[PDB]
Amino acid sequence: AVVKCKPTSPGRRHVVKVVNPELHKGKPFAPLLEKNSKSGGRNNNGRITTRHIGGGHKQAYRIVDFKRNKDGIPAVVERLEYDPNRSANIALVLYKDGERRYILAPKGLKAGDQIQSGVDAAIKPGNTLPMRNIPVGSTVHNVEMKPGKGGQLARSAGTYVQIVARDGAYVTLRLRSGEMRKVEADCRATLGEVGNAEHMLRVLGKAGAARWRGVRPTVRGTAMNPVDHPHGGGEGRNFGKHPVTPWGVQTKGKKTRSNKRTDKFIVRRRS
Amino acid sequence: MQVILLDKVANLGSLGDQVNVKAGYARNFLVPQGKAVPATKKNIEFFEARRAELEAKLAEVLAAANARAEKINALETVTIASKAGDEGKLFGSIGTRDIADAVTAAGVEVAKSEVRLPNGVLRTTGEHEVSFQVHSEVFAKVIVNVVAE
Amino acid sequence: SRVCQVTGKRPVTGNNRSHALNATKRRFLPNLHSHRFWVESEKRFVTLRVSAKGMRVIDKKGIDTVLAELRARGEKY
RNA sequence: CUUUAAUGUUUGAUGUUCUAACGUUGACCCGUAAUCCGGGUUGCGGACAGUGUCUGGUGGGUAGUUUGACUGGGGCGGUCU
RNA sequence: GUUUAUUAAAAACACAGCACUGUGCAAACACGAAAGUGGACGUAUACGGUGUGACGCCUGCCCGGUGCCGGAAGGUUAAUU
RNA sequence: AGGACCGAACCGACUAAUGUUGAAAAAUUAGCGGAUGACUUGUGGCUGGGGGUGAAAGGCCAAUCAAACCGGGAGAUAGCU
């Protein structure tokens, strides 16, 4: 659910928190954590390659299974854990042989549910199987681009991929952006839609909330100096120029896609 | 260049001829795996006498290849049971690896790269005919039987 | 480095002479490509970062002789 | 000889298919108790992409520069033979 | 809340929110002659850029100029030959 | 519970006076703002000059910055004093 926080003090007036009562409260599964280092937006050369990244609360990486390499084993969910590394929630599934792994929690998955990934993989929300055995027209998430790569499509919150047609050894997919893409049928994916979809309704209420998520304030170019930004500045607020990126690349319309290698896998762009 | 052919490759030579063939075809096809040898004014006379013995010994290995082609026809059918569903829908698929593994475990060993399956994909239960590549001019047909399990 | 293995060709430097005869320094770069070559004496696929001109050189010289040239000056292939 | 018809060659344009060049930040094994790299076996693209030389277009992102003189101070206005 | 350390603390910057646009992953973009790295061990409810700046009511008309996105009838057009 | 309130340490520097060859190459006194957070601080590390960093003042980068400092070209050049 979504709760609008009462305006007890300025800065909490517009806060709209997202509450998940069934989300587990407590420490995660210790063996499935890895050390995460904040880069701060700096590469190995130490320069800020991408801006507005720095600070924020410390986070521990969760090993989320995207490949589903081991197949044909019944699985049961145990708990849902908050994952700071991604918008979507994660679920801790215990295999019938005693192995615990992390998977992306779909919308229809709650506590005390049973999933089955295998060659048969009866069509239920949460099952994992290749596209050759998935009916055309179902909501599918955690889609792959290559066989065995593991979960490279529709990983965010409330996102899904719809299958429109097969037409041979490939499969045509309607991506969430609105673009038709062709992938080989050997790619493995999961049925159902991904979990919590009310991620829009949270608005963070204040500047400080965005500060501890790792986002630094952004300086608009029109308030900068000509030596710093192409927009620069004059006496008062003056623009007089076409909007461009700080590196002199025209913005608001100029397409920057130049691949010429994956174009054959695309039959229709977004709109 | 002036490469000299040494096999029964497609119609651009007559088992030894100085032709005007671009280096793209000559390399990566003729130099790595038989069928020819570059002629740089030194192998032209060396291989002239070599036509007597290697060509003669090459004319008998092809007879042995036909013998394996005739020997493998002792069954004319190979049965493989694989998981499948209704309306002839197969959960998995069968390729050159499975056919080669089935034949090797049954009779004379065969290479999976020798399987000529252009069209090519096994998706239905029943009878299927697959051709082989025992020679550039000789082909063998074997009927495979996939059964839903 | 962008150096041909068999011919030993290295990038050179030149000028960007425009219509106004302006001189701007530039580099001429060779046509290096990593190609795999088959050898009969050693029965192995050898990979060489060879230039386009070098490939024509090994066509007449042969892969055996050019490998001897590499071993003559201690080049590693 | 002007014209045209038909086998066989040579060179261009389009379209399909194939793999051996090439790519692989796909899977497995080894060096090797190693997310580098290399080698091997497959899978997917595939003569595409990408790179080198030349070439047309764009290109204040960057660089070197120019932006006259007389003048009842300078600028503006006016003039320069 | 931040800012001209050492004459300017502000109506300046930032801000949550909003809108446009680019990006299907070997992503766009950025740092690097390159390898590679950040983006991100993230995957369009995500990331970058731009403008405005809580909230309420709204954001009217104009595509001639410049830029951007598509079109192919037609003309010019380099290297090449 | 709060980027809540009053107010010490702590951080900062809005007003006035003194000081202006000063106790001090920006301080003292009296007042002042924040003071559980976009807070502050200790230790260590990284980003190097047409570059870094910048809640953006062309501010900061060793008492300096519209291109730091040291050495070299170099006895640059000066129709100027």
From Swiss-Prot, chain A:
Pfam families assigned: Ribosomal_L2, Ribosomal_L2_C
InterPro entries reported for this sequence: NA-bd_OB-fold (IPR012340), Rib_uL2_dom2 (IPR014722), Ribosomal_uL2 (IPR002171), Ribosomal_uL2_bac/org-type (IPR005880), Ribosomal_uL2_C (IPR022669), Ribosomal_uL2_CS (IPR022671), Ribosomal_uL2_dom3 (IPR014726), Ribosomal_uL2_RNA-bd_dom (IPR022666)
One annotated Gene Ontology cellular component of this protein: DnaA-L2 complex
SMART domains, per database record: Ribosomal_L2 (SM01383), Ribosomal_L2_C (SM01382)
GO MF terms, alphabetically ordered: RNA binding; rRNA binding; structural constituent of ribosome; transferase activity; zinc ion binding
Biological processes per GO annotation: cytoplasmic translation; negative regulation of DNA-templated DNA replication initiation; ribosomal large subunit assembly
Family matches, as Gene3D superfamilies: 2.30.30.30, Nucleic acid-binding proteins (2.40.50.140), Ribosomal protein L2, domain 3 (4.10.950.10)
Biased composition (Low complexity): 38-47
Annotated positions of the N6-acetyllysine modification: 241
The entry's keywords: Acetylation, Ribonucleoprotein, Ribosomal protein, RNA-binding, rRNA-binding
Function: One of the primary rRNA binding proteins. Located near the base of the L1 stalk, it is probably also mobile. Required for association of the 30S and 50S subunits to form the 70S ribosome, for tRNA binding and peptide bond formation. It has been suggested to have peptidyltransferase activity; this is highly controversial.
Quaternary context: Part of the 50S ribosomal subunit. Forms a bridge to the 30S subunit in the 70S ribosome, contacting the 16S rRNA. Interacts weakly with S6 in one of the 3.5 A resolved structures. In pull-down experiments interacts with CedA.
Family to which this protein belongs: Belongs to the universal ribosomal protein uL2 family.
Additional free-text comment from the UniProt record: This protein can be partially replaced in vivo by its H.marismortui (HmaL2) or human (L8, from the 60S cytoplasmic ribosome) homolog.
HAMAP family per the UniProt record, alphabetical: Ribosomal_uL2_B (MF_01320_B)
Protein name, as recorded: Large ribosomal subunit protein uL2
UniProtKB/Swiss-Prot annotation, chain B:
Sorted UniProt keywords: Acetylation, Ribonucleoprotein, Ribosomal protein, RNA-binding, rRNA-binding
GO molecular function, a single term: large ribosomal subunit rRNA binding
Entry-annotated residues carrying N6-succinyllysine: 71, 83, 112
GO biological process per UniProt: cytoplasmic translation
One GO cellular component term noted in the UniProt record for this chain: cytoplasm
InterPro entries, per the entry: Ribosomal_bL9, Ribosomal_bL9/RNase_H1_N, Ribosomal_bL9_bac/chp, Ribosomal_bL9_C, Ribosomal_bL9_C_sf, Ribosomal_bL9_N, Ribosomal_bL9_N_sf
Pfam families: Ribosomal_L9_C, Ribosomal_L9_N
Domain of life: Bacteria
Modification type N6-acetyllysine: residues: 89
Subunit: Part of the 50S ribosomal subunit. In stalled/collided disomes (pairs of ribosomes where the leading ribosome is stalled and a second ribosome has collided with it) bL9 in the collided ribosome contacts bS6 and uL2, while it contacts only helices of the 16S rRNA in the stalled ribosome; the inter-ribosome bridge thus formed is different from that formed between normally translating ribosomes.
Function: One of the primary rRNA binding proteins, it binds very close to the 3' end of the 23S rRNA.
Family as reported in the entry's similarity comment: Belongs to the bacterial ribosomal protein bL9 family.
HAMAP family with a match to the protein in the record: Ribosomal_bL9 (MF_00503)
Annotated protein name in UniProt: Large ribosomal subunit protein bL9
Organism annotation: Escherichia coli (strain K12)
From Swiss-Prot, chain C:
Keyword Ribosomal protein: yes
One MF term in the entry's GO annotations: structural constituent of ribosome
Keyword Ribonucleoprotein recorded: yes
Gene Ontology cellular component annotations, sorted alphabetically: cytoplasm; cytosol; cytosolic large ribosomal subunit
Keywords: Ribonucleoprotein, Ribosomal protein, RNA-binding, rRNA-binding
One of the GO biological process terms: ribosomal large subunit assembly
UniProt xrefs under HAMAP family: Ribosomal_bL28 (MF_00373)
Sequence similarity: Belongs to the bacterial ribosomal protein bL28 family.
Subunit structure: Part of the 50S ribosomal subunit.
Protein name (Swiss-Prot/TrEMBL): Large ribosomal subunit protein bL28
The organism of origin for this protein: Escherichia coli (strain K12)
Upper taxonomic lineage: Bacteria, Pseudomonadati, Pseudomonadota, Gammaproteobacteria, Enterobacterales
